């Protein structure tokens, strides 16, 4: 979906690179780990920046793991992460980038939005929507939907993967609901509101069947009950909005199906408060009333979610990409300056240690 | 007095052994979830903690899955959520994980505390980082979570003296010639009732000794 | 003697004989034995009613105030005694125990009525 200009790697290929042989840096890091000393972020930066083969990708993975479990782990620089993902895409090792991204705790790979888009778009271009969905779930877990390009790509991938799915595991429902709610909350258009409703319906089903802790535990979601109430609130909001904003019939069908299926360990709630299971009948009545209201107002789209998201992408992705490319180039120059400063500081401290050792 | 040199030798070698065998957080605060015991010491956790130990997360179990270990993010506690209606949280400013941990799920953290809607001036170290009590506030919820309107906190400014002390004070006044009829009062606006679950100073707290 | 830490506390040291207790209110190091070394004797307390049907408590109020102002702690029985004297507020547990006793006697009266 992303243009050639966005995914172009020429500018990164032209970065100033100080050449090392990966074996030498690997041996230096192995000795430093033998002595239980801290490895600098410049060493790992140079090792990641001098990968020249698919086996060197495997070695760099191991040394990323070692650096993560070392004193200087949080000094892993953003240009290093970007270069890691670039090298993985370059040497046909996308499974390695996805592995380090999924196991981000063990490797410390926290990409910026440009890098998420690059990886997701590679997976999409090779029609591997399963791995693109995995990348979308990682974006959701890291709460990196702050850029419209990522939001649009994630929504496209999510609706593509939903259109061909019938059997839902509750973990899958939770992941899909969160991954659709988070980007949907940032899109003030028909697609965004439909995504909000669909995700709220899924999360409400999970809450009612498996409990609220199943919803919020290890998730970027709140611990407050009433997800179906929030779905109905989205419906009410759409009722009282400008004319342009509408709501997809498919999401409304999903919410209706969830309510129809729902109306057919520690206690975390106060006993003076009403449970959601006791509020399901009123939710169903409100859903029917609001559905009639939306039909009367003509606030319902007949177009499918996937087609609507396709049209929105072809309308907005180009401008999003232009803004992202400007930011990416600015970041590249800032990274160059930071790296030169780091190298100079490394030289200075090497000198100081040398005079101390001579004294 | 025959100088006791073996005592000095023993003290010095014991100190050296202690400083070269300092246990790490991953060892001190590991837990066996089946028996709910610390493998380091073999001591069982108190019963009232058991459920939370099996349900809630330690702070760095949350922070190790965030970029930059979650600086700037808001973290609250389950016990605070159950106890207080006003927002209570830490705004993280510094994190130092225990790198020896396999999942980087132990370590120390610093932040600015907001307790019951009242924020502190400076950042200090967070206590109970090793407790299975922590929750991460989603970024799309923070504005709703932090919303707090300071209610009028108008409490009593003075209390009566106890009966005998009041009588003695009045008697002393009357003996010294004063005939004032104003009731003696004890000033308590300066005594601020600090809740028992307010965070203490983690800097002053001790650490389990290696053994 | 030198102790590792500790503080002064105003407490009740038990003397008398078997079945005849008597208390001396003393300010003492908290690590010292109950009836051992003390800093000062601040009063006394006879828990047995005398021929006038009275329990006698002597309190050296000046010295009690002095030692509280010097950083001395108070044991719970001593706090309850001072609350009974009116020197302190009534301790929360005296009030709570009074309410518990009221409820128990009310239950007994209700049992009598039910029978």
């Amino acid at each position: 979906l992303l243009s050639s200009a966005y995914v172009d790697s020429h500018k990164w290929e032209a970065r100033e690179k100080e050449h090392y042989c990966l074996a030498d840096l690997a041996s230096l890091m192995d000795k430093t780990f033998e002595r239980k000393l801290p490895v600098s972020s410049l060493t790992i930066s140079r090792l990641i920046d001098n990968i020249s083969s698919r086996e060197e990708i495997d070695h760099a993975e191991y040394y990323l793991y070692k650096f993560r479990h070392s004193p200087n782990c949080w000094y892993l620089r953003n240009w290093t992460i970007h270069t890691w993902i670039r090298q993985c895409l370059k040497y046909d090792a996308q499974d390695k980038a996805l592995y380090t991204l999924v196991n981000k705790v063990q490797y410390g790979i926290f990409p910026d939005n440009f890098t998420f888009n690059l990886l997701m778009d590679s997976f999409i271009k090779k029609e591997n929507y399963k791995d693109a969905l995995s990348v979308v779930f990682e974006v959701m877990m890291q709460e990196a939907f702050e850029v419209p390009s990522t939001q649009l790509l994630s929504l496209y991938v999510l609706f593509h993967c939903l259109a061909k799915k019938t059997d839902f595991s509750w973990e899958e429902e939770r992941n899909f609901g969160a991954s659709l709610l988070l980007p949907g909350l940032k899109q003030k258009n028909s697609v965004g509101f439909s995504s909000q409703l669909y995700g709220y319906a899924l999360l409400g089903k999970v809450e009612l069947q498996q409990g609220l802790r199943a919803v919020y535990h290890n998730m970027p979601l709140i611990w407050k009950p009433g997800y179906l109430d929030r779905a109905l609130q989205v419906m009410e909001k759409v009722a009282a909005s400008p004319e342009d904003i509408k709501l997809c019939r498919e999401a409304l069908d999903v919410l209706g199906a969830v309510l129809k299926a729902l109306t057919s360990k520690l206690v975390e709630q106060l006993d003076i408060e009403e449970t959601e299971q006791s509020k399901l009948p009123q939710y169903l009545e409100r859903f029917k009333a609001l559905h009639s209201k939306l039909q009367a107002l003509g606030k319902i789209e007949s177009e499918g979610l996937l087609s609507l998201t396709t049209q929105l992408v072809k309308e907005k992705l180009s401008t999003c990409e232009a803004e992202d490319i400007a930011t990416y180039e600015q970041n590249l120059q800032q990274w160059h300056l930071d790296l030169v400063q780091l190298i100079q500081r490394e030289q200075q401290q090497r000198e100081q240690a040398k005079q101390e050792y001579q004294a | 007095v025959r100088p006791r040199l073996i005592a000095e030798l023993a003290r010095r070698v014991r100190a050296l052994r202690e400083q070269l065998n300092r246990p790490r957080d991953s060892q001190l605060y590991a837990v066996d979830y089946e028996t709910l015991t610390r493998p380091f010491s073999g001591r069982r956790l108190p019963v009232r903690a058991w459920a939370d130990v099996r349900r809630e997360s330690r702070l760095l179990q949350l922070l190790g899955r965030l970029p930059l270990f979650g600086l700037g993010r808001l973290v609250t506690r389950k016990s605070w959520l159950w106890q207080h209606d006003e927002p209570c949280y830490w705004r993280l400013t510094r994190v130092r994980p225990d790198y020896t941990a396999q999942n980087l799920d132990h370590g120390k953290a610093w932040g600015i505390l907001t307790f019951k809607g009242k924020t502190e001036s400076e950042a200090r170290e967070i206590e109970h980082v090793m407790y299975h009590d922590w929750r991460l506030v989603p970024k799309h919820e923070e504005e709703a979570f932090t919303a707090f309107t300071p209610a009028p906190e108008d409490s009593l400014a003075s209390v009566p003296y106890p009966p005998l002390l009041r009588a003695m004070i009045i008697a002393e006044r009357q003996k010294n010639g004063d005939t004032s009829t104003e009731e003696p009062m004890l000033n308590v606006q300066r005594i601020r009732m600090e809740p028992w679950d307010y965070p203490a100073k983690q800097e002053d707290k001790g650490r389990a000794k290696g053994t | 003697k030198a102790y590792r830490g500790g503080h002064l506390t105003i407490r009740l040291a038990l003397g008398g004989c078997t079945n005849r207790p008597f208390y001396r209110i003393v300010a003492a190091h908290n690590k010292c034995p109950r009836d051992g070394r003390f800093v000062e004797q601040l009063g006394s307390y006879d828990p047995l009613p005398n021929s006038h049907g009275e329990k006698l408590v002597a309190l050296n109020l000046d010295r009690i105030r002095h030692w509280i102002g010097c950083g001395a702690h108070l044991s719970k029985p001593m706090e309850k005694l001072l609350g009974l004297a009116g020197f302190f507020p009534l301790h929360p547990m005296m009030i709570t125990n009074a309410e518990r006793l009221r409820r128990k006697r009310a239950r007994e009266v209700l049992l009598a009525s039910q029978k």
Partner: peptide, 30 residues
Amino acid sequence: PPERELSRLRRLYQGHLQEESGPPPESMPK
């Protein structure tokens, strides 16, 4: 106590609760 605080206590001490006590008798029963 207000009912909300009592429900809060019942959640905190779930499974280890005694019967709630009402206000005491006004005076000591005889």
